[PDB]
Symmetry: C2
Amino acid sequence: HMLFQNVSIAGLAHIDAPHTLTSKEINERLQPTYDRLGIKTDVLGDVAGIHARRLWDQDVQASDAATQAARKALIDANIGIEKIGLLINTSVSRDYLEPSTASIVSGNLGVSDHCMTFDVANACLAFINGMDIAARMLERGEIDYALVVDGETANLVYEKTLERMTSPDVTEEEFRNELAALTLGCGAAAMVMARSELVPDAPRYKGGVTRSATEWNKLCRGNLDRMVTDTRLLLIEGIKLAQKTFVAAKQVLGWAVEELDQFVINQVSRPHTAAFVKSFGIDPAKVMTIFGEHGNIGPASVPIVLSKLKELGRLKKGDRIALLGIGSGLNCSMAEVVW
Amino acid sequence: LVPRGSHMLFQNVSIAGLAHIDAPHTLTSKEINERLQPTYDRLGIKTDVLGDVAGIHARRLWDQDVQASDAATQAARKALIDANIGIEKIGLLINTSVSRDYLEPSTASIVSGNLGVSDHCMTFDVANACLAFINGMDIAARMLERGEIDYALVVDGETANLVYEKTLERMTSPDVTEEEFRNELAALTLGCGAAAMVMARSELVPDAPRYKGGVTRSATEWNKLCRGNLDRMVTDTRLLLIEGIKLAQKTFVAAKQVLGWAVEELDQFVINQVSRPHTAAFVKSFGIDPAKVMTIFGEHGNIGPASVPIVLSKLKELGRLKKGDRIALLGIGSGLNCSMAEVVW
């Protein structure tokens, strides 16, 4: 109905974590347990389509990775830290329960005393929610520039999920609900959003829609050491929810699939992506994918994909870009960017 | 005569419903002190640091199996009754608690699923230590003002059971050091509780309190002062006090400019509930009459972000609030962050 008209994307950056763990290396470590429990499918490589993921140096915290992404994004926007009025952290990974990881990143950067900070959590949709929050403050004139940051760390989840499941007493069906933890990846991203009158040639964020099906909130449940997931059910219901969200997006954004130049989606696995593409009848050329080599980087995967698109020169002035997230909740958000 | 700007204050946003839940089991500072007494003896501690210095006589706890979502959900049902609306009217639900069931999904999604929100309802969590309920209120108010929703729930359930249990064990260790004992003591001032607020477009609830918003300042160079995980909170209460008050004084200069505030013109100050020295420092630093600052930490401890709406609900329930009262909401949270916002009853 009334879209955002003066919110721009002034800067955008991602960080690839530096250590590679391949699914071949994981599978060798788990072969005993694959054997002594009779499993013959390579679930990571063949079903999920995840061949590697990246991990940080030890003791990199979420705040550290978010800080590194933030600095890059500020250089991409060509602004100093003193112009930032809002810093929102959207990661699943968090240094503490308190304070917010946002305050830590904000302190590492040296934001001013006018800078407002807080964290948003919402599984793989939180970056888009963070963008939407920021847009609302930009539009109203509360701030000129915002940082939305997201660092994800899966190092501990790998150490405990693995070392767990390689021990003498390891059972099953457990296995199928925990191997999903072995699809997770490390990475970070950041974006600088701004009032359009400050950065007139920049991409524009128009906003979007959200629909929910919170009857299914038990399906995917993650802490520091463990993620237990029902992958089948998440997929199917996720897609039904997305179809409903797409009817809303038609109503508020004038969306039809044939007019969108890119779909930037949260990156989960080959079956999640194929089912999305097949259901909606989307040309797969419009859907870049990174999970083969990075796994599932949660809410950072959206901006990481967009930033990769930008750095490869795939995005042209006037491109209509759909940002979308299907996340645990279940929740679905779809938003537009005009490049 | 001279037209001024709104200073970015919210327009046409109201408070339609408000409620709190008190946790059921009382844990007295007398009981805690009896358990800490051999450690006190060994460290030479001769004063009642909980009851006499902090001013906390008791706090409440839930049962061990109560999650943040369960408590929030009970507060939310009460707030919806107070607003006289069904869950179907809610277009936004924000959970603001420090305590959380999981890292994902959001605790707001659990609450929402418990209450049966519709498929139009947007949900997510906000985390910002003791300021987050106000941050949630602001976020919802921006949506309400813009006309995107009619009603929002801001909810907050706090559970301190685990922190109590594990702190008391570490604090009674024969090998605990003075510095660790001092660093962890503040965790024994925490309390359990929950709150929830229904916010609405003012045209739907014409006689309801109005929420104006206000101003925020930060000092994120002090982000190490109070750090907490699921079973441990470490706090430098001396610099939190000093640097908190310094941040508050700065935020209050901004409030004078945007809200027109003067201490003499506010009917109540609703502050996050920390301890007697923090409250005495705040009141003396600003010259506030103590009668206008209701305190619940004496019997409930520090309930984090829920403290602000719990105090507001308890003022409401006591009949301390009258139409036209100018209520200052002031939060100084770990970070450091400070917000000062106005409600006109």
